[PDB]
Design a protein around this ligand. Sequence first.
Ligand SMILES: Nc1nc2c(ncn2[C@@H]2O[C@H](COP(=O)(O)OP(=O)(O)NP(=O)(O)O)[C@@H](O)[C@H]2O)c(=O)[nH]1
Ligand SMILES: [Mg+2]
Length: 283
Amino acid sequence: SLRIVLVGKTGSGKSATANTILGEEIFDSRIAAQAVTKNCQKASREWQGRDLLVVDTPGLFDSLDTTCKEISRCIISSCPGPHAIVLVLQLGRYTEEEQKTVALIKAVFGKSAMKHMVILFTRKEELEGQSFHDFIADADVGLKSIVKECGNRCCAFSNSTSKAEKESQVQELVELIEKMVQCNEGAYFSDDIYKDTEERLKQREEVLRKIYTDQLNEEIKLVEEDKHKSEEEKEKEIKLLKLKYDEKIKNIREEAERNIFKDVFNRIWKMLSEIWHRFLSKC
Ligand SMILES: Nc1nc2c(ncn2[C@@H]2O[C@H](COP(=O)(O)OP(=O)(O)NP(=O)(O)O)[C@@H](O)[C@H]2O)c(=O)[nH]1
Ligand SMILES: [Mg+2]
């Protein structure tokens, strides 16, 4: 299993990138004068060997409230921790919004997060006769710097362009991610946040297990000691109940993720309120 999070500016091609990872178009990718993704979204894909889990995020910079909301959502979805945090840029310069984005990940998740960051570019088809190598070779101090921090993990993507090319890019991305993780002591990203937020997640899931079971064992109890009902009626009812139960265990993960939101939000809000002086737009 691979947990990857796509963060970046608005319009950078995050959703497109997600689509090309997922093999089909799930998320909304189009050209806009607005944010097309207003909400953290997640999906899964059957791959050669693994289940790929892709977290698409709203464009980081456009609100302390909103930023805190979406980050928190991102954290919950990415639990227990992400394998790769992919910073998505349009081809060319490393710009101020990406600078602040990188600053944010650093600030909230520590500097220790930069081992799991990979840089991904979109519009690969736009460079034409120039090599991507040649491309990153002409780069600037800031781009070179962040590439260095990220361990020289860089990709270019063409979302348009055949499936076989696209899936090959997927091979590149996934492989490098596995390389990175292996060199990273073979585990996902784990933070003070992630540990706590996961513990909460586990606690509430076990709780809901206590709830749903005690609900089903009760509904069953009525049917057993109920008279005037045929045994076939008892059996048909209980069978349906058990079906609804097995459907309701499938539900716990999504329902659990919803319960902790405000708690993690508050925790992040405590932290982030002080810090926001760094991410204001001056002027
Ligand atoms: N040529 C080309 N265009 C691309 C590529 N990736 C994205 N685009 C273009 O960039 C536009 C923005 O796509 P989108 O995925 O919506 O960006 P986004 O990151 O989702 N924006 P947001 O995060 O606000 O929803 C699309 O209309 C698409 O045509 C790429 O690899 N090549
Ligand atoms: Mg989007």
